[PDB]
Coordinates of C-alpha atoms and ligand atoms in Angstrom, one line a residue:
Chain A
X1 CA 171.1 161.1 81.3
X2 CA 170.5 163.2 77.8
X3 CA 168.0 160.6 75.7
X4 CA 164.4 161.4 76.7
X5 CA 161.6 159.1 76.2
X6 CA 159.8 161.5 73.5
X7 CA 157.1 158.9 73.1
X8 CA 153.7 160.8 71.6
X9 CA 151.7 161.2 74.6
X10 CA 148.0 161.1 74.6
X11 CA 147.9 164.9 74.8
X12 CA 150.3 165.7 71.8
X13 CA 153.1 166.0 73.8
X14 CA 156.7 164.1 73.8
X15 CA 157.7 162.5 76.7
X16 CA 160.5 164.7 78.8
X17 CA 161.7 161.6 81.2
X18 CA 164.9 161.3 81.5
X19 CA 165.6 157.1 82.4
X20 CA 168.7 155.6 81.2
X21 CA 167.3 152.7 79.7
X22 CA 163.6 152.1 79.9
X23 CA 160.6 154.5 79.8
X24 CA 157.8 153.1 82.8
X25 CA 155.2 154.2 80.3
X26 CA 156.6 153.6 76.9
X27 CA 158.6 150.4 77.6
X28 CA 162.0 150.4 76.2
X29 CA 163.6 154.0 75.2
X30 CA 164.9 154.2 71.6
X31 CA 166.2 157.2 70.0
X32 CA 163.2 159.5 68.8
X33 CA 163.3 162.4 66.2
X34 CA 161.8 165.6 67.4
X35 CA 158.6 164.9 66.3
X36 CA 158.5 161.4 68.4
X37 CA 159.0 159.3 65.6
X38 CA 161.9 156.3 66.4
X39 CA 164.9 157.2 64.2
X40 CA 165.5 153.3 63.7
X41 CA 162.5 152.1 60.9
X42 CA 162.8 148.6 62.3
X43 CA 162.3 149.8 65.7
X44 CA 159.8 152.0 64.8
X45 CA 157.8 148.8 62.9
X46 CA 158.6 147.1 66.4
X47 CA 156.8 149.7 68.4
X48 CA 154.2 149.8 66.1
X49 CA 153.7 145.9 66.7
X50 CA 153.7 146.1 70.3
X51 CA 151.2 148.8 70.1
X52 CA 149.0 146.9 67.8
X53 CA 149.1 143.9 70.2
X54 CA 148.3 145.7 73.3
X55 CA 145.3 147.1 71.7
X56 CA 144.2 144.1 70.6
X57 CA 144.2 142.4 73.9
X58 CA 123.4 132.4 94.0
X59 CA 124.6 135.7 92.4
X60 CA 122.4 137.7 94.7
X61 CA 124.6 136.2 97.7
X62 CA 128.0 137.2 98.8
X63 CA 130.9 134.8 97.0
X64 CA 133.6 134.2 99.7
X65 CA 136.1 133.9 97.1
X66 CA 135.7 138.1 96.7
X67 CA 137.8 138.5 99.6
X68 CA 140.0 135.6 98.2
X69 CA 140.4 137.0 95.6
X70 CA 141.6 140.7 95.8
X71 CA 145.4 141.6 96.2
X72 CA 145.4 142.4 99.7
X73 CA 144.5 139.2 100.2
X74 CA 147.1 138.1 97.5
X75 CA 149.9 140.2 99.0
X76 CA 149.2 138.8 102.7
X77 CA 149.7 135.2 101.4
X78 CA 152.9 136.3 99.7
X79 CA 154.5 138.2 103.1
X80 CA 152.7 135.8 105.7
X81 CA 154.3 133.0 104.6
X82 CA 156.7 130.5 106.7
X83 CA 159.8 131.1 104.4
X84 CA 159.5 134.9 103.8
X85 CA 159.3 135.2 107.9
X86 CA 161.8 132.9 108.2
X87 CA 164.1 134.8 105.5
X88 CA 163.1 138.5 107.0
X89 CA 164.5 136.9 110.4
X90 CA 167.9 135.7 109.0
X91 CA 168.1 139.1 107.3
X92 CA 167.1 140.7 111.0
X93 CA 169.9 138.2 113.1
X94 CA 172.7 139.6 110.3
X95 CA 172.2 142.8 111.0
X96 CA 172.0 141.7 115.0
X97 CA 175.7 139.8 113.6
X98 CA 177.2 143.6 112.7
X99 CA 176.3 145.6 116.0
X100 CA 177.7 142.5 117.5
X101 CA 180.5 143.7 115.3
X102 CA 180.2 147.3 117.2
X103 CA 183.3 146.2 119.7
X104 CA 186.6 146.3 117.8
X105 CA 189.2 147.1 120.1
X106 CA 188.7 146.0 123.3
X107 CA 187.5 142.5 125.1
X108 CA 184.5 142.5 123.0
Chain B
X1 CA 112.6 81.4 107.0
X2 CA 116.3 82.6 107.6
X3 CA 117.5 79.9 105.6
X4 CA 116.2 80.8 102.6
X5 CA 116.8 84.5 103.1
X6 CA 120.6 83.1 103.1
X7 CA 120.2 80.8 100.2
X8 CA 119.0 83.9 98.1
X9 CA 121.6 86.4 99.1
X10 CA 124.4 83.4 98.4
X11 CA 122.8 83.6 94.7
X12 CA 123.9 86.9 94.5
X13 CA 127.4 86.8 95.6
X14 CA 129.8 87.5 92.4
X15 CA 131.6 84.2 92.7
X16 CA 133.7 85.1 89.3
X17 CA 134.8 87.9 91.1
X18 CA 137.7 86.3 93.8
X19 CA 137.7 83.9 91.2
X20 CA 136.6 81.1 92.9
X21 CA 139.0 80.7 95.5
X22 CA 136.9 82.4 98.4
X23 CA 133.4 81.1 99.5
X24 CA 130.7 83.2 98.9
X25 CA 130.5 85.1 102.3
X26 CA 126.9 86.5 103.8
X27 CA 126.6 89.3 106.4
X28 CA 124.3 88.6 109.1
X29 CA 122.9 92.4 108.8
X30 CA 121.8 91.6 105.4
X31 CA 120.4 88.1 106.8
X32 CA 118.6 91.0 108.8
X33 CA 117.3 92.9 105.8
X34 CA 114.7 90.2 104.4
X35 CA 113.7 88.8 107.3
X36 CA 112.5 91.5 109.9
X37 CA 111.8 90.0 113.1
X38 CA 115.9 90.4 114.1
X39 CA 115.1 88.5 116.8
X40 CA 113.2 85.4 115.1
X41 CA 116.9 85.6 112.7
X42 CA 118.9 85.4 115.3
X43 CA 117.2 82.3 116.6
X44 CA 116.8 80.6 113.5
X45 CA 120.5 81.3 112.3
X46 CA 121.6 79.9 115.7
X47 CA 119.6 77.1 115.1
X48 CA 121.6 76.6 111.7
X49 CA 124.6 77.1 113.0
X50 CA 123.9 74.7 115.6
X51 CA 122.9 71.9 112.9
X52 CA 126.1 72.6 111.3
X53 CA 124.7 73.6 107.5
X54 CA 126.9 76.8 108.0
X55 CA 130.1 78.9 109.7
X56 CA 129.8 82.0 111.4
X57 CA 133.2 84.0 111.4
X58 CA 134.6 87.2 112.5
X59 CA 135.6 89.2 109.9
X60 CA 136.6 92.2 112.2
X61 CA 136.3 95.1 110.0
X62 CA 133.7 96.0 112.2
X63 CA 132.8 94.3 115.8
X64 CA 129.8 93.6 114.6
X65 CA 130.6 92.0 111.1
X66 CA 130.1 88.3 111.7
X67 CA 130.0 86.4 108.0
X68 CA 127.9 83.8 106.9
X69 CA 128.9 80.5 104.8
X70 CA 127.7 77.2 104.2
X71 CA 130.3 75.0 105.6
X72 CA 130.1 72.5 102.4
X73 CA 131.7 75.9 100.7
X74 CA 133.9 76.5 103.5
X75 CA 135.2 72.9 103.4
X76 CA 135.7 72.5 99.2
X77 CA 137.5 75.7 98.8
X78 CA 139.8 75.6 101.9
X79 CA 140.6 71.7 101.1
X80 CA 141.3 72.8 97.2
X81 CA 143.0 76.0 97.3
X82 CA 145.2 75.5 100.5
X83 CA 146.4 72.4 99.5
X84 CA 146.9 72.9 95.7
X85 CA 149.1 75.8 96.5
X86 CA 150.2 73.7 100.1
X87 CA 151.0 70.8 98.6
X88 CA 154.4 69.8 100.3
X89 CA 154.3 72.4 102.3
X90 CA 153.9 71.4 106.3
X91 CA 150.8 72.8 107.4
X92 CA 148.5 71.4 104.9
X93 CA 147.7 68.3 107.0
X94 CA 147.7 70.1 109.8
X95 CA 144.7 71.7 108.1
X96 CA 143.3 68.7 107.0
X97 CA 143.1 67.1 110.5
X98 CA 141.2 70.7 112.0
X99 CA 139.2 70.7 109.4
X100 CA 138.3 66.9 110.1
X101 CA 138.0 67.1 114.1
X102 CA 137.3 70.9 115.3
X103 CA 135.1 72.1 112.7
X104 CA 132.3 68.9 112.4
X105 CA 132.3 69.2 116.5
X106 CA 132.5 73.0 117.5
X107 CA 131.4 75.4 115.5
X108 CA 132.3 78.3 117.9
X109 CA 133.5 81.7 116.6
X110 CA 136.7 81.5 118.4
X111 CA 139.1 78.7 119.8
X112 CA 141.3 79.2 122.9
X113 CA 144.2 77.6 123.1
X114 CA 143.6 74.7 126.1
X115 CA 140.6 73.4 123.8
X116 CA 143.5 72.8 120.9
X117 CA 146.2 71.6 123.3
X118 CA 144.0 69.2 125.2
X119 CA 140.4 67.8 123.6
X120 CA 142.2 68.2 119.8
X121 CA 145.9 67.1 120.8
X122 CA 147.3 69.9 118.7
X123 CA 150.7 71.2 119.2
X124 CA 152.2 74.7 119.1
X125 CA 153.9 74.0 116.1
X126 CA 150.8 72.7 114.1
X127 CA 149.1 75.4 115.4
X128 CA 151.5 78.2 113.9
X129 CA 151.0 75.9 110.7
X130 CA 146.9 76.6 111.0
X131 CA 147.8 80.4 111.2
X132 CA 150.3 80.4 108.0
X133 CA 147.3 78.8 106.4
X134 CA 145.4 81.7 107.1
X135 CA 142.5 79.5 108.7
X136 CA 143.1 81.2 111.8
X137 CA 144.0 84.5 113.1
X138 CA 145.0 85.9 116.5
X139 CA 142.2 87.0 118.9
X140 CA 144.7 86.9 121.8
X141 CA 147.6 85.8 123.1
X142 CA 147.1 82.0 123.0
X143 CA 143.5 83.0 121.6
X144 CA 142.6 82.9 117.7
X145 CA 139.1 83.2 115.6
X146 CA 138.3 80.9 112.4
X147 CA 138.7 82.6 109.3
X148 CA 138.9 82.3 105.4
X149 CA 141.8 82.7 103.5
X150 CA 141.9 85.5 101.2
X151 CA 139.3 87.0 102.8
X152 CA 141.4 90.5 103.0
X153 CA 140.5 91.0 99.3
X154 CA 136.7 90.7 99.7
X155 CA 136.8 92.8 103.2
X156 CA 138.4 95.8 101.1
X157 CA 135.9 95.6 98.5
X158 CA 133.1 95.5 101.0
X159 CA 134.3 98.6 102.8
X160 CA 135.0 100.9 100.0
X161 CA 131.6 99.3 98.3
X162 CA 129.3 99.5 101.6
X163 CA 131.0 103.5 101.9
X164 CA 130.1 104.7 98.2
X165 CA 126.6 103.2 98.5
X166 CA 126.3 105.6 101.6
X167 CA 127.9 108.1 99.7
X168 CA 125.8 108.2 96.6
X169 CA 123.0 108.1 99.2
X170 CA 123.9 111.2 100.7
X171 CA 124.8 112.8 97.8
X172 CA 121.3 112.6 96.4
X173 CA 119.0 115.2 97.3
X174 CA 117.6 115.3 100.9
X175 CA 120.1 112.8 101.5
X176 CA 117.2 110.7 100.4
X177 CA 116.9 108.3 97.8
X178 CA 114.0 105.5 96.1
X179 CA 115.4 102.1 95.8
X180 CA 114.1 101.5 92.7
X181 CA 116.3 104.4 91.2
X182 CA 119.4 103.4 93.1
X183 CA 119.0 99.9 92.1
X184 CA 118.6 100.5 88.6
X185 CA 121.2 103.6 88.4
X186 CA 124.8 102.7 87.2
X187 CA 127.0 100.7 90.0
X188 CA 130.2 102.7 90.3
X189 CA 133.5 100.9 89.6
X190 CA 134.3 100.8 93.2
X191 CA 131.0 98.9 94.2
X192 CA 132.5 95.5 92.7
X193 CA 129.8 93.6 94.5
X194 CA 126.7 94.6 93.0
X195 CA 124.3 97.4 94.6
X196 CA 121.4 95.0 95.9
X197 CA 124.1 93.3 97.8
X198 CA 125.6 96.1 100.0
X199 CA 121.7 97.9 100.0
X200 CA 120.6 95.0 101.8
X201 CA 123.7 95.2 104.1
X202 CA 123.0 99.1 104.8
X203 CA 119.0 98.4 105.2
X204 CA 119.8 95.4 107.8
X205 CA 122.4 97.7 109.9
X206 CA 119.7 100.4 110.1
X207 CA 122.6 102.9 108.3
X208 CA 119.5 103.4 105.8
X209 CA 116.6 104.3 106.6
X210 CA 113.6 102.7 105.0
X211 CA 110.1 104.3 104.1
X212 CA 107.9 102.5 103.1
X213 CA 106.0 105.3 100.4
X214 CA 103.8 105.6 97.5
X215 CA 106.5 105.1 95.0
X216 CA 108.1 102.3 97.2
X217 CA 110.2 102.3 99.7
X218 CA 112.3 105.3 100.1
X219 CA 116.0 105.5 101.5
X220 CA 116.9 108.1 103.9
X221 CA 119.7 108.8 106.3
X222 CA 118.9 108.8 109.9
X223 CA 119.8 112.3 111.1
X224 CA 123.4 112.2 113.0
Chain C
X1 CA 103.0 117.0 91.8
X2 CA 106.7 116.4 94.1
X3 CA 108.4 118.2 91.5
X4 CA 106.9 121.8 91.4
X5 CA 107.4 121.9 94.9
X6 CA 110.9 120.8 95.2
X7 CA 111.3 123.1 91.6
X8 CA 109.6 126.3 93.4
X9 CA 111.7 125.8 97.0
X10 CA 115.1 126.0 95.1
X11 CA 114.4 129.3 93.6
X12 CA 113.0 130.6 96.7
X13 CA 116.3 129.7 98.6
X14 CA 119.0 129.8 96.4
X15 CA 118.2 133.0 95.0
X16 CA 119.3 134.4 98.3
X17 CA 116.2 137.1 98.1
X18 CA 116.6 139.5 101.4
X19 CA 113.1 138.9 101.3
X20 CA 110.5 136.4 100.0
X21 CA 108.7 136.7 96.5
X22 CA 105.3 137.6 97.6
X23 CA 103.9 135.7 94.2
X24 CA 105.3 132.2 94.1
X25 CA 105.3 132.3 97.9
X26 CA 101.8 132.7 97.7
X27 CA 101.6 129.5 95.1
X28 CA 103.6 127.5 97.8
X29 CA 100.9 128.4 100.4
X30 CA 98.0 127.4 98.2
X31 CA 100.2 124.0 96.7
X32 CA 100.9 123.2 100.5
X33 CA 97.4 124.1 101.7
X34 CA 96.8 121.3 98.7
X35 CA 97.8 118.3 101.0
X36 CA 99.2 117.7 104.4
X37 CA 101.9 114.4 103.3
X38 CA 102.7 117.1 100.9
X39 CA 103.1 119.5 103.8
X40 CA 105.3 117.1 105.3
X41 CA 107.5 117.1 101.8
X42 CA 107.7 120.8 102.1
X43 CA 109.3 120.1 105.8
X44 CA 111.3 117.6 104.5
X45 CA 112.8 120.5 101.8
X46 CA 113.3 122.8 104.0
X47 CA 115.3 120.7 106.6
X48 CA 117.1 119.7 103.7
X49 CA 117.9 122.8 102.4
X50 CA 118.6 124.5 106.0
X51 CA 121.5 121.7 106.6
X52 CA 123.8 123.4 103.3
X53 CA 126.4 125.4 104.3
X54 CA 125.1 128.7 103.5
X55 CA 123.6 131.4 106.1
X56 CA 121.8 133.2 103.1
X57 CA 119.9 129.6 102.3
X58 CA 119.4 129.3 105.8
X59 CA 117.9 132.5 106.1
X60 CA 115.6 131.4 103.6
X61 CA 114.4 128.4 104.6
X62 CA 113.6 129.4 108.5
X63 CA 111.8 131.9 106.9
X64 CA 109.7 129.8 105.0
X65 CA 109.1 127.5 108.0
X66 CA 108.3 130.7 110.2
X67 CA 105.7 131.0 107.3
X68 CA 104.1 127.8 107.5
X69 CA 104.4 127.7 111.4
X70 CA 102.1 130.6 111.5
X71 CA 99.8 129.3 109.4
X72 CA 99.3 126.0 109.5
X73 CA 99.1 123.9 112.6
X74 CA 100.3 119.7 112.0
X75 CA 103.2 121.7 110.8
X76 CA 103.5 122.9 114.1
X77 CA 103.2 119.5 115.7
X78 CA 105.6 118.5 113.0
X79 CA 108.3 121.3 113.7
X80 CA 108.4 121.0 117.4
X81 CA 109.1 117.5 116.9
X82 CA 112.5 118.1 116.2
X83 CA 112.7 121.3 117.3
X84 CA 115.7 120.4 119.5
X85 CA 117.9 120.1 116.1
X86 CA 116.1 123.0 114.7
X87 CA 117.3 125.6 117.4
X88 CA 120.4 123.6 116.7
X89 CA 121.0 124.7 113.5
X90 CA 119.2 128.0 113.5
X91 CA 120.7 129.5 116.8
X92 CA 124.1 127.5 116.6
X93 CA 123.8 126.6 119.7
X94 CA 126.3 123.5 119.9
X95 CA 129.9 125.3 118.8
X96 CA 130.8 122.2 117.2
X97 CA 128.2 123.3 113.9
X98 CA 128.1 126.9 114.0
X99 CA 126.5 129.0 111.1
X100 CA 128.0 129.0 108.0
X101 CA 129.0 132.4 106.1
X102 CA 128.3 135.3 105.2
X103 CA 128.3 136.9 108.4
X104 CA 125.6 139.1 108.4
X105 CA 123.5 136.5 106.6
X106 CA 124.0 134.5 110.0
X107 CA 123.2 138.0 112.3
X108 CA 119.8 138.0 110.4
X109 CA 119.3 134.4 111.2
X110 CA 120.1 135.0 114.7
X111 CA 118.1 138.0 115.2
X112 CA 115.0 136.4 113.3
X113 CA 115.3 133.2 115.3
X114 CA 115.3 134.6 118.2
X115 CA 112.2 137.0 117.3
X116 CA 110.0 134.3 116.2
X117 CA 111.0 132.2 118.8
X118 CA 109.6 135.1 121.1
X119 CA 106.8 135.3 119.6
X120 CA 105.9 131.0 119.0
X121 CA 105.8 131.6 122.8
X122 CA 103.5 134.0 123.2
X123 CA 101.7 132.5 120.5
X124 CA 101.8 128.5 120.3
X125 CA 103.8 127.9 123.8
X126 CA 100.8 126.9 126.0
X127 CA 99.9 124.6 123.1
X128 CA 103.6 122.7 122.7
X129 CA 104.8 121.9 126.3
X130 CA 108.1 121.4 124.0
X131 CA 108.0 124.9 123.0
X132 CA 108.0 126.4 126.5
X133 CA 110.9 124.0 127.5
X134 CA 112.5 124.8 124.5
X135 CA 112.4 128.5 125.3
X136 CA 113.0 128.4 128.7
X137 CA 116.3 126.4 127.9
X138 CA 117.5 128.9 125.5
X139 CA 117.0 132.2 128.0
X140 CA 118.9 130.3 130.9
X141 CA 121.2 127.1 129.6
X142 CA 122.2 129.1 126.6
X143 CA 121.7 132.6 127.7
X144 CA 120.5 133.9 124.6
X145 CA 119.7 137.6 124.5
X146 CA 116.0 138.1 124.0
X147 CA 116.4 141.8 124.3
X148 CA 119.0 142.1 121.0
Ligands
LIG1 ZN1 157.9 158.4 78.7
LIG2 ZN1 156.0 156.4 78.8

């Protein structure tokens, strides 16, 4: 892994992460200068354009949908649902299917 | 008088509406709603009934949903419509000899099957004939009630009518409503009957209740 | 004048105040002390209001007929009445229609209730046969703890 991010970070400083293909902060790594600027113009106009679109874009009583609406609550619909169970026990039963593999040689 | 209480709410059934082919049809709660003594009604319509002006039937959407029609209307639109689209087709004398014997003499709500086979001399088969007419419709085994044909159409507008009116009742505030403003507010397109019709149904069921107030007579639902 | 009072009721309950606006509760004693059928309206608002699924509004409303309770005495007649549905929806007595949310909306409502419930017996119970009945019923068939 020798490309680094080298994105300008808020504090003046080039990124140092070394990720084969994408930077978590910066998005997709292209081949900087030393001073942080893409080598590519075209890539550099395209970072620019991303950047320039990202910046761009009964009160007083309790609303039930608050607890609704929050991402534990999300999350807990997503994992407690029928299917994922159901696929989390298949998974579980396979691996129950290999230690059931655990007798080679003999009877079992 | 409960017959004129009968003749006016007649007046307002939408006859365009099943387009002609079903009598208009009265419900004896709404025969209820303009004349108050329940008890003088019930007398007076028995005493109708009796006379043979009109037909009481079961129309069994609700056990206690007996409907009101003149008999003359009874008599015209059964005769035309069953035997314009019957014509050739067995059971229409069948009909025609019912309608000529049973209905002049008895005018009981249901007919059990000795009365048929003995005082009337009708058979099994022209007895399955009355029922493919529609003109009657099981109670029992070997037991049936009078009915209307087509009268399915006008039962399901009823029900989701009578239902909505209650609805838009509740939905106003206090579940309370004036009948003035209900009256004169827009009928909604399930409500194919008009709204004075089914009020008078929900008033003469007590569903609705009335209070008598200052600004009229206000509706509100009895607590549940 | 239906419409002031029906006007002034909905901010006093769906505002969901912890506690009662001292100034236009004080215009709703005065406009009620106006006339009794009107009184009666004010009943008919707040048994309205206390049916809506909300324990905040519900709050609200028991207040304000804790309010007129104490002060005013056809409403008393009035109130006891129907107080059978009354404890029914304040106390959530039958399971069947408990309280609606939030939950410490409905502990407030509970603990209230019950304290002026206390207190119309000491106060009004000799006066309303009903009342006593009505107490004695929730300290035994219901067991409701007085002491909370
Ligand atoms: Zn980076
Ligand atoms: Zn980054």
């Amino acid at each position: 892994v020798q490309h680094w991010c080298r994105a300008p970070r808020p504090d003046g400083r080039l990124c140092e992460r070394q990720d084969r293909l994408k930077c978590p902060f910066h998005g997709k790594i292209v081949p900087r200068d030393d001073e942080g600027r893409p080598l590519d113009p075209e890539d550099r106009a395209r970072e620019q354009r991303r950047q320039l679109q990202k910046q761009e874009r009964y009160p007083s009583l309790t609303n039930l949908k608050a607890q609704a609406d929050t991402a534990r609550a999300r999350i807990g619909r997503k994992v407690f649902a029928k299917a994922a169970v159901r696929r989390v026990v298949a998974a579980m039963n396979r691996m129950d299917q290999k230690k059931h593999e655990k007798f080679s040689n003999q009877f079992n | 008088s409960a017959r004129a209480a009968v003749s006016e709410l007649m007046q307002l059934f939408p006859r365009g509406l099943f387009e002609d082919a079903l009598p208009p049809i009265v419900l004896r709660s709404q025969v209820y709603s303009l004349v108050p003594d329940r008890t003088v009604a019930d007398r007076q319509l028995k005493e109708l009934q009796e006379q043979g002006e009109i037909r009481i039937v079961q129309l069994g959407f609700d056990l206690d949903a007996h409907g009101i029609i003149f008999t003359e209307d009874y008599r015209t639109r059964v005769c035309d419509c069953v035997l314009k689209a019957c014509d050739g087709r067995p059971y229409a004398g069948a009909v025609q000899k019912f309608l000529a014997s049973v209905l002049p003499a008895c005018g009981d709500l249901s007919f059990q099957q000795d009365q048929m086979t003995q005082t009337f001399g009708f058979r099994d088969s022209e007895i399955t004939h009355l029922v493919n007419a529609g003109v009657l419709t099981v109670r029992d085994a070997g037991s049936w009630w009078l009915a209307v044909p087509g009268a399915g159409r006008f039962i399901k507008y009823f029900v989701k009518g009578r239902q909505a009116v209650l609805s838009m009742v509740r939905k106003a505030k206090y579940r309370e409503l004036l009948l003035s403003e209900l009256l004169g507010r827009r009928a909604p397109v399930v409500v194919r009957l008009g709204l004075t019709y089914h009020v008078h149904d929900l008033i003469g069921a007590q569903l609705v209740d009335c209070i008598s107030t200052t600004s009229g007579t206000l509706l509100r639902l009895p607590e549940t | 004048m239906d419409q002031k009072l029906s006007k002034l009721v909905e901010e006093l309950t769906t505002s969901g105040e912890p506690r009662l606006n001292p100034e236009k509760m004080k215009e709703l004693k005065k406009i009620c002390k106006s006339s009794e059928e009107q009184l009666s309206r004010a009943y008919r608002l707040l048994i309205a209001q206390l049916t809506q699924e909300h324990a905040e509004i519900r709050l609200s409303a028991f207040q304000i007929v804790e309010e007129l309770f104490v002060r005013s005495h056809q409403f008393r007649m009035l109130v006891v009445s129907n107080f059978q549905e009354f404890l029914e929806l304040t106390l959530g007595t039958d399971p069947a229609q408990p309280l609606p949310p939030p939950r410490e909306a409905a502990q407030r409502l509970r603990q209230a209730t019950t304290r002026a419930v206390e207190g119309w017996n000491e106060k009004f119970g000799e006066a309303y046969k009903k009342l006593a009945l009505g107490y004695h019923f929730l300290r035994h068939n219901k067991k409701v703890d007085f002491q909370d």
